[PDB]
Enzyme design. Sequence first.
Site, mmCIF file in Angstrom:
data_model
loop_
_atom_site.group_PDB
_atom_site.id
_atom_site.type_symbol
_atom_site.label_atom_id
_atom_site.label_comp_id
_atom_site.label_asym_id
_atom_site.label_seq_id
_atom_site.Cartn_x
_atom_site.Cartn_y
_atom_site.Cartn_z
ATOM 1 N N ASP A 239 63.918 -0.449 9.141
ATOM 2 C CA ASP A 239 64.401 -0.177 10.731
ATOM 3 C C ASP A 239 63.802 -1.241 11.506
ATOM 4 O OD1 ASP A 239 65.143 0.420 13.227
ATOM 5 O OD2 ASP A 239 64.034 2.312 13.090
ATOM 6 N N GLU B 200 72.292 1.654 12.662
ATOM 7 C CA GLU B 200 71.457 2.491 12.593
ATOM 8 C C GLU B 200 71.797 4.168 12.667
ATOM 9 O OE1 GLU B 200 69.418 0.917 15.994
ATOM 10 O OE2 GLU B 200 68.833 -0.896 14.807
ATOM 11 N N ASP C 287 71.151 8.458 19.793
ATOM 12 C CA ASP C 287 69.966 7.598 19.531
ATOM 13 C C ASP C 287 69.536 6.932 20.827
ATOM 14 O OD1 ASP C 287 68.273 5.858 18.550
ATOM 15 O OD2 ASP C 287 69.469 4.773 17.100
ATOM 16 N N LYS D 190 64.949 -8.801 19.798
ATOM 17 C CA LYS D 190 66.345 -8.225 19.535
ATOM 18 C C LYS D 190 67.302 -8.049 20.550
ATOM 19 C CE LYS D 190 67.940 -3.937 17.107
ATOM 20 N NZ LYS D 190 67.426 -2.540 16.659
HETATM 21 N N1 LIG Z 1 56.905 10.785 23.321
HETATM 22 C C1 LIG Z 1 57.594 9.935 24.055
HETATM 23 N N2 LIG Z 1 58.277 10.218 25.022
HETATM 24 C C2 LIG Z 1 59.090 9.534 25.864
HETATM 25 N N3 LIG Z 1 59.348 8.090 25.345
HETATM 26 C C3 LIG Z 1 58.822 7.884 24.155
HETATM 27 C C4 LIG Z 1 57.825 8.615 23.496
HETATM 28 N N4 LIG Z 1 57.408 8.072 22.566
HETATM 29 C C5 LIG Z 1 58.018 6.780 22.366
HETATM 30 N N5 LIG Z 1 58.817 6.535 23.700
HETATM 31 C C6 LIG Z 1 59.637 5.491 23.993
HETATM 32 O O1 LIG Z 1 60.496 5.216 22.828
HETATM 33 C C7 LIG Z 1 61.176 3.784 22.972
HETATM 34 C C8 LIG Z 1 60.787 3.313 21.763
HETATM 35 O O2 LIG Z 1 61.714 3.977 20.404
HETATM 36 P P1 LIG Z 1 62.257 3.795 19.232
HETATM 37 O O3 LIG Z 1 60.979 3.202 18.414
HETATM 38 O O4 LIG Z 1 63.168 4.596 18.657
HETATM 39 O O5 LIG Z 1 63.041 2.425 19.560
HETATM 40 P P2 LIG Z 1 63.745 1.208 18.708
HETATM 41 O O6 LIG Z 1 64.138 1.986 17.737
HETATM 42 O O7 LIG Z 1 62.293 0.050 18.491
HETATM 43 O O8 LIG Z 1 64.664 0.477 19.731
HETATM 44 P P3 LIG Z 1 66.226 0.085 19.306
HETATM 45 O O9 LIG Z 1 66.732 1.234 18.752
HETATM 46 O O10 LIG Z 1 66.721 0.043 20.551
HETATM 47 O O11 LIG Z 1 65.982 -0.975 18.573
HETATM 48 C C9 LIG Z 1 60.083 3.202 23.681
HETATM 49 O O12 LIG Z 1 60.870 2.835 25.112
HETATM 50 C C10 LIG Z 1 58.819 4.082 24.108
HETATM 51 O O13 LIG Z 1 58.511 3.988 25.375
HETATM 52 MG MG LIG Z 2 66.081 2.315 17.007
#
Ligand SMILES: Nc1ncnc2c1ncn2[C@@H]1O[C@H](COP(=O)(O)OP(=O)(O)OP(=O)(O)O)[C@@H](O)[C@H]1O
Ligand SMILES: [Mg+2]
Length: 541
Positions: free
Chosen positions: A7, A170, A193, A69
Amino acid sequence: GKIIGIDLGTTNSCVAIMDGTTPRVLENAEGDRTTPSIIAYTQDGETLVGQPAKRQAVTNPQNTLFAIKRLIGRRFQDEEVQRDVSIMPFKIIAADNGDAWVEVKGQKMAPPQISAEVLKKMKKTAEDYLGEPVTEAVITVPAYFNDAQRQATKDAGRIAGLEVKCIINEPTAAALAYGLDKGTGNRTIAVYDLGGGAFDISIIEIDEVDGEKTFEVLATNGDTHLGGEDFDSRLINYLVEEFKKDQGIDLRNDPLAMQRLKEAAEKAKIELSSAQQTDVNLPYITADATGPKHMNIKVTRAKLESLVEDLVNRSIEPLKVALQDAGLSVSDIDDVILVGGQTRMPMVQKKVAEFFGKEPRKDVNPDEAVAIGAAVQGGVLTGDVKDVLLLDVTPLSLGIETMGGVMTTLIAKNTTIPTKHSQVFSTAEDNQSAVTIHVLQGERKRAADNKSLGQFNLDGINPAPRGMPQIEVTFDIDCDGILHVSAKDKNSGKEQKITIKASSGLNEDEIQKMVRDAEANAEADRKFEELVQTRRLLLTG
Ligand SMILES: Nc1ncnc2c1ncn2[C@@H]1O[C@H](COP(=O)(O)OP(=O)(O)OP(=O)(O)O)[C@@H](O)[C@H]1O
Ligand SMILES: [Mg+2]
């Protein structure tokens, strides 16, 4: 040997593998099951990736890269890139070819080179766990990525030293993860998502027939303006405005302060998913002629909810469109799957449960499901996962218009994707200098009874009798469901082509009506095609 699932997130990356029948999410050297998608180039010549890059960001805003990204596969003049240029503390430049690049310490770098650094860390995390080399990977992308975004992600894979066996979307990955549980067959799910970079919704059918479990996307869309970084921005703006109100200083022209304020805001947002209030405490945030200045601002959950309410509500409309495009009601959704760290916000969970009228499933890990599903697809390709199939087939026949107003099929209905088919056509008139390729979709034999998907011209045809020129028409549908149509004059070498986006949904209710309608008119359509055919198939001007 083994195929790893990665991922590659806007914010966080995660790597998983099939350990026999069960997937395993792999920890990195600090012990973490996810790795920040952050790359830093330090004053002393090091390249940092992950949490070490994150920890030195607030002091090195120029040479710490994040959210790459948002740039990958994009052109420098792209709307989103220009919107991104200002807010990002690093230098975004145009390459000699017009692509969006970055410059660090005077080095101009393409985004796939930067993302490769995160993917190498994922590979090594896997190689460390297996005690063997890993070179094959399934890499995921948002469902909204186009060909250039996907190809560039494939590039980052190669640059990282990976054979990219597969790119999958995804939400589809998350569905494969969920579909490992028992009792999940013959169900429709909604995958909601909300990640760091964007909001995506997909409606996916999990069917089980003759022991085989199949996974098919019925609708997808989303919004790249509703991601967790947009949540962060609302709280940052509120912290800027409150510090102005409290002390009359506008932090926005102070980059180091804004970097500290961004990180603090995200941490406060996160904390407010668990607590009802939190305190943003940033000493020595700036200074003026009277000495140093300090921030201490309390933020309640209700205040946060007020700040991002419109963002959460804007996610509802893409859900409604996705259901319309799949031809489904809410009552047809058997389960709701939350993916993404930003779905952990209680307000998001409640709004989703309200819309669907049911509680999201709780046995799906929103940080890990995408990586898990990518690993599942890896095991499918190695033969370790049996009786699992990602189903991607054309819903309707695809073709072009030929002489007499006939639809001539190049790719038949229910052909598995990816696929490629060619046919050679000629001209309908002596000395015809050009042909019009009219791309059509449907099951009827009269071109005008089918849907027009696009058209283009091929000219430069050398004078010759009708039927003599050789125009090769190629339909190629890639794994992203994007249809590439080309037409090439074999004798002049001239070629022209177009790209036709994938449909946002597959509405089986309407597809089966169209199929039955064609079958009701088969004889009339046959008679039509026959007494037109009494004239190698030919193209008009
Ligand atoms: N407990 C929480 N409450 C609210 N927001 C959170 C929490 N934990 C993480 N986040 C938020 O989740 C986001 C990142 O989530 P995730 O890791 O699923 O993204 P990603 O998969 O890297 O992003 P994308 O799918 O856009 O490529 C960030 O904006 C972060 O601040
Ligand atoms: Mg993601």
